[PDB]
Amino acid sequence: RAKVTSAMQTMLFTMLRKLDNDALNNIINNARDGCVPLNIIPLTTAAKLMVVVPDYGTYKNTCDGNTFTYASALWEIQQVVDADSKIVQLSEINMDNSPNLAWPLIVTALRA
Amino acid sequence: RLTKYTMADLVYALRHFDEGNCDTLKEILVTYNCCDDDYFNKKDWYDFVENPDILRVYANLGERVRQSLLKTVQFCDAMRDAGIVGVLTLDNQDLNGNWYFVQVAPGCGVPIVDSYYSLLMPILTLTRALAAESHMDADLAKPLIKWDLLKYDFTEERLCLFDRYFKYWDQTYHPNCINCLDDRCILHCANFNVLFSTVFPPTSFGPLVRKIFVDGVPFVVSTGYHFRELGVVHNQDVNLHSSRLSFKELLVYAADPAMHAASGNLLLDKRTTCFSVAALTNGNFNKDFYDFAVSKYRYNLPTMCDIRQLLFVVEVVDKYFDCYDGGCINANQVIVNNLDKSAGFPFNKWGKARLYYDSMSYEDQDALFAYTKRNVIPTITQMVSICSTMTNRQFHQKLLKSIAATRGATVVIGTSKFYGGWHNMLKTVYSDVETPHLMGWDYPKCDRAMPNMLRIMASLVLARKHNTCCNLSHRFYRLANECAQVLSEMVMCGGSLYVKPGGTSSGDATTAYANSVFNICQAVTANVNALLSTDGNKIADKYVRNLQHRLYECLYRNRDVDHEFVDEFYAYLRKHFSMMILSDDAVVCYNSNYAAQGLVASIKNFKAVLYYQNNVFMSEAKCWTETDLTKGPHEFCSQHTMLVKQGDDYVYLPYPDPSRILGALMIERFVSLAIDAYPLTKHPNQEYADVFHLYLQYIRKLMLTNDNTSRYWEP
Ligand SMILES: [Zn+2]
Ligand SMILES: [Zn+2]
Numbered sequence: 014r015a016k017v018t019s020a021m022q023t024m025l026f027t028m029l030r031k032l033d034n035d036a037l038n039n040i041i042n043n044a045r046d047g048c049v050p051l052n053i054i055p056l057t058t059a060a061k062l063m064v065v066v067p068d069y070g071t072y073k074n075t076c077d078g079n080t081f082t083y084a085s086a087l088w089e090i091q092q093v094v095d096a097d098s099k100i101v102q103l104s105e106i107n108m109d110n111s112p113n114l115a116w117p118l119i120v121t122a123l124r125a
Numbered sequence: 126r127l128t129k130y131t132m133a134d135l136v137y138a139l140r141h142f143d144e145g146n147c148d149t150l151k152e153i154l155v156t157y158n159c160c161d162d163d164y165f166n167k168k169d170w171y172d173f174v175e176n177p178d179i180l181r182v183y184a185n186l187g188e189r190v191r192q193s194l195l196k197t198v199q200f201c202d203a204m205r206d207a208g209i210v211g212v213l214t215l216d217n218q219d220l221n222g223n224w225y226f227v228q229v230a231p232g233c234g235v236p237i238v239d240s241y242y243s244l245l246m247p248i249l250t251l252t253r254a255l256a257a258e259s260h261m262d263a264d265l266a267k268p269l270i271k272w273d274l275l276k277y278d279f280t281e282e283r284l285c286l287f288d289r290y291f292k293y294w295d296q297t298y299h300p301n302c303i304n305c306l307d308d309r310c311i312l313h314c315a316n317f318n319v320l321f322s323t324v325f326p327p328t329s330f331g332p333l334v335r336k337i338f339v340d341g342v343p344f345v346v347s348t349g350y351h352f353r354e355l356g357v358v359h360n361q362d363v364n365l366h367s368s369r370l371s372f373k374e375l376l377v378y379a380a381d382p383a384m385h386a387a388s389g390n391l392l393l394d395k396r397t398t399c400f401s402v403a404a405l406t407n408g409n410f411n412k413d414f415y416d417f418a419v420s421k422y423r424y425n426l427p428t429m430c431d432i433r434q435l436l437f438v439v440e441v442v443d444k445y446f447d448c449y450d451g452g453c454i455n456a457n458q459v460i461v462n463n464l465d466k467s468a469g470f471p472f473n474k475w476g477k478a479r480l481y482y483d484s485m486s487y488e489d490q491d492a493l494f495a496y497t498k499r500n501v502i503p504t505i506t507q508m509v510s511i512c513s514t515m516t517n518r519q520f521h522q523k524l525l526k527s528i529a530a531t532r533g534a535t536v537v538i539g540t541s542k543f544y545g546g547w548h549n550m551l552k553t554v555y556s557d558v559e560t561p562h563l564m565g566w567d568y569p570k571c572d573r574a575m576p577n578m579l580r581i582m583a584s585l586v587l588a589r590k591h592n593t594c595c596n597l598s599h600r601f602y603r604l605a606n607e608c609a610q611v612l613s614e615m616v617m618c619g620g621s622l623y624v625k626p627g628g629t630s631s632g633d634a635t636t637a638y639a640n641s642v643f644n645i646c647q648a649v650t651a652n653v654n655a656l657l658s659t660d661g662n663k664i665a666d667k668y669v670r671n672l673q674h675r676l677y678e679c680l681y682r683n684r685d686v687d688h689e690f691v692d693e694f695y696a697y698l699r700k701h702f703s704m705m706i707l708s709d710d711a712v713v714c715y716n717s718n719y720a721a722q723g724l725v726a727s728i729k730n731f732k733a734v735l736y737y738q739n740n741v742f743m744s745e746a747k748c749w750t751e752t753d754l755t756k757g758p759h760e761f762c763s764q765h766t767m768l769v770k771q772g773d774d775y776v777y778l779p780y781p782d783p784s785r786i787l788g789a790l791m792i793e794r795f796v797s798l799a800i801d802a803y804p805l806t807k808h809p810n811q812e813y814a815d816v817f818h819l820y821l822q823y824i825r826k827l828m829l830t831n832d833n834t835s836r837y838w839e840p
Binding site for chain 2: 014016020021022025029031037040044047050052054058059062063065066071075083084117
């Protein structure tokens, strides 16, 4: 039992270090009674956003250029990694080079 | 200045749908510009799986449907003020919502709307009747409501809709199902919540969380859950400023997505249509056999039910379950064989179910079970974890084992085909039907598109055994727990957490049984509809003529359950519509002399019922009718049936398709294949017999003999 107990505690504390922040306090403090839906916490506490894009047209309407808007925030792209785990530059994502990209691409961005 | 068609014709066209005789529906959709005429030249234009665009087209009737509901409420106020007492029907209201009864006293009237709304209910989520209500003043021509993300209750919003559209539905409504007096009331309210919830944000639903503290350190945990069907359910055993967490509390928290999603990455996934919450991050080919042989959830839609019918059918469904035993068992009474099963995320990062069953004492297992009778734990599954399965067995296993140990019953789970079992099961369904024919059918998307309302009905049926061990509040929390754990749980896919819209779960304890409750419900519904939809004045048999009359009056009148009527109706179905049911697999032996008159359901009733009950179209390609009982069902338990001589008598034997068998302690697998192939040697086609013999040669080279195999069919 002890092995499991330790694993659960280790995991919960790792998450607590990530979780305990000002953003969490702001969403809970704005609640009428301290209760919020879980599905809206990441929209306020996640500083980092993962965007998964299946093709070029979607990319243009999702993450065109250095910044984009999502969850009522402006996001700044830090990196793009393809389906083969290679680094792709923003300057490399265009119509002409679309056939050479390992779609879907995953875009990593931070809150502006 | 009335329209050509009435609300009754729209409801009939959608509920008694036939892709052949679909002229009423096609004309209405063209007439009101839902689609053009060329729309009906598409292959399978009426399907929901193929050509999913049909939903866009049905939705174009949504404004028309809410206008009819609003006109009804205004009509009802007018007749109330006028002192008029009477009944509202769908053939007295046209498709523009226009209306066309006795007087008692000014200010004292009352509408009867029980059939009025129940008949419409199945098409209100189909046509998106409340599509306008997501807009600021409930007008599609204006912008959407900027709903507060932190709003999680919506009690007032549901009450406002209830009193706007169903004002005269004179039955107590409990937006939060936790306040229901019995299981019937639970289904009564949930049915409204399904429709009302269609206009609330997707983020407003799901686990509800709070900041709590342990040793001064904040955690985000679930302290309740918001269900699309059940409303808001709060937890009671929520303890803040604790010093340490117990093993049990740690299991509850580890399983709780509140800790994982709130602490993860934001996720925008454009590859899907499903709602996501957070990212948590940044075959065996048997060549030897082959060479030897060669040498020789996106479719799960909110679905509203006809409640007057659902509450009748469920009593009939319960009768079909009035032979087995059930109730609650303790932790030390639970039998678990699959201890090699993954414990589920995050427990599967540490071990298999054995790791947890051998760690918790029986007292701790009982305590976790008790927790779920007072609170809700919204666990995480992966594309069902131990914090769900450890307690689902204590609640359901006695019943599941009872069903599995009972032979001769309508629901047959766990009954071997061997030693005459196939034969006995067939004789059991054939029974004494006067003019027997055999029928069977598939269920498209049975594990994906099954509505949460029918999943709730099935879990309530399985829970109806808990009468001498559970109070009302406890039964409700157990329902809330089953719903949070298998209908709207979190599922990890890859490294991210997504929300499941509904359907079934192959990892749960009850799926194989809940599916049989469902199969009966749909069949009863088909028979209730087959009889109620026919002309009662064309029935020569006075008995059935009276049965149809009384059946109508046991659904839309006489709300209290008439148990004598239900026993009689049940017996009627038992005699003329005999069912043999396995999880999503059924054979029906029916009396065609009555089906021919519309007094018994046929395949066309199943097609119409699945069309509006599960939002799926059932193709004739997988449906069958067999007129000669010399041969058995075309396919049951994925096997074909033939009558052969055995013991200077005749028996029915199953057999799988010969190509499927060859396409399929390694020797143990081959022995099982050879046994399944054995009956093929009784078949007149030598090519079938050769499958069995091929395996014996392989097995012996890897002792299985003809005698060690023929014994499997000797009682
Ligand atoms: Zn209720
Ligand atoms: Zn009980």
